[PDB]
């Protein structure tokens, strides 16, 4: 808790400065993939293939 003062005719002014650095990270893409239905759904049975 840090309450700021208030008055009719009072202001505040800085007299010095400094420089800082900051980092940010963003995803851009995912890993592609591919599938062939026949191999996965049916191993070798010819009747299954028909």
């Amino acid at each position: 808790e840090n309450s700021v003062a208030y008055s009719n005719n009072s202001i505040a002014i800085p007299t010095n400065f400094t420089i800082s650095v900051t980092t940010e990270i963003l995803p851009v893409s995912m890993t592609k993939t591919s599938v062939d239905c026949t191999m996965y759904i049916c191993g070798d049975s010819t009747e299954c293939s028909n």
Binding site: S34, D36, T38, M39
Partner: protein
């Protein structure tokens, strides 16, 4: 499923070699036994027997 192909790259299929021979491997004994004789038993026992 058409006659005309536009330029680009396509994936048709995956090549698969097909089988040629059939192989069976079993243990090695060639003797008969009383299977039929157990079936053809003169007297048949009970469940408790």
């Amino acid at each position: 499923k058409s006659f005309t192909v536009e330029k680009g790259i396509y994936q048709t299929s995956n090549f698969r070699v097909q089988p040629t021979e059939s192989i069976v491997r079993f243990p090695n004994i060639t003797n008969l036994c009383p299977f039929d004789e157990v079936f053809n038993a003169t007297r048949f026992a009970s469940v408790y027997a």
